[PDB]
Amino acid sequence: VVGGTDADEGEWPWQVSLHALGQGHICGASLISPNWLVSAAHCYIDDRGFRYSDPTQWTAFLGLHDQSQRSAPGVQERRLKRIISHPFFNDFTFDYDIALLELEKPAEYSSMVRPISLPDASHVFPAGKAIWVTGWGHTQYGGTGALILQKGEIRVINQTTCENLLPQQITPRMMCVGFLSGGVDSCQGDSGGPLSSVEDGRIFQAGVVSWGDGCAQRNKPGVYTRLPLFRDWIKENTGV
Ligand SMILES: CC(C)(C)NC(=O)NC1CCN(C(=O)[C@H](Cc2cccc(C(=N)N)c2)NS(=O)(=O)c2cccc(-c3ccc(CO)c(F)c3)c2)CC1
Ligand SMILES: [Cl-]
């Protein structure tokens, strides 16, 4: 996250960190039940010969605050049973950039480990709404990840504006969120993490960090997968 600030301990207890064998933190995810996470398909594609699609080469950290303190109180470490990539995911366009990760053993809910509510298929996040992005991604384009979980408040962008700003690249599965003046944005390593929409104190996951043209540039807001469209796919494949 570029332009954000340190999250408080326990503040985003649905945020998960996904580590790939021998590489440290690579992507984010969100807890939606004791057994299931939501993440980005593109994180789990074989590439450069490393087998990112191999569920046995991932470790999920739940309840994590600081990447240098992975044995801290409240952290739950889990292996993955399987990765369900969306069948329409396209690795050239990044259309349908979503995946479901099954934990080997269930999480135990705690002050630091809690699920986030799914939106039903009719749920709207209108252009202009302020929502939150979190992750351990880079804090500058071309920089390094954050040890402490970062948070940033960003705004939903109009879909026509989004299309014109990133021409020939936006599909209806995608939403632009950020600021047209840049400054606050997700970045490499935030992929797969949640957009958290805070209302009356109810919180919904609005989308999934997917991609961007650089990070925090003017007129180049981050691009996110829209979660309401996938409610029935999640139910069908996980029961959640
Ligand atoms: C293994 C596999 C082949 C699947 N690749 C993979 O997973 N690549 C990841 C893809 C996701 N990545 C990025 O989009 C990065 C960083 C980033 C990440 C998340 C949010 C933001 C943000 N700003 N909110 C920014 N941004 S980037 O460096 O500009 C870059 C590098 C490579 C590729 C494309 C890219 C994007 C879109 C299109 C479609 O038009 C495209 F053609 C290229 C952008 C890392 C790298
Ligand atoms: Cl504002």
What is the residue extent of each domain of the chain? 1-12+116-228, 13-115+229-240
Distance CA 128, CA 156 (A): 5
CB-ligand 1 contact for 173 (6 Å cutoff): no
Q: CA angle, 93 as apex, 88 and 94 as ends, to 5°?
A: 60
Residue showing tokens 């939501």: 38
The answer to whether the CB of 194 is under 6 A from ligand 1 is no
Among the atoms of ligand 1, which is closest to the Cα of residue 216?
A: 23
Please state how this structure was obtained: X-ray
How many angstroms separate the CA atoms of 223 and 129, rounded? Answer: 15
Strands of the chain, DSSP E:
5-6, 15-20, 24-31, 36-39, 58-62, 76-85, 99-103, 130-135, 150-156, 174-178, 194-198, 203-211, 222-226
Q: Has 181 been annotated as catalytic?
A: no
Catalytic status, residue 213:
no
Give the separation between CA 115 and CA 131, rounded to whole angstroms: 17
Please tell me the distance from the alpha carbon of residue 162 to that of residue 185, in angstroms, as a whole number.
15
* Residue 47 is a catalytic residue: no
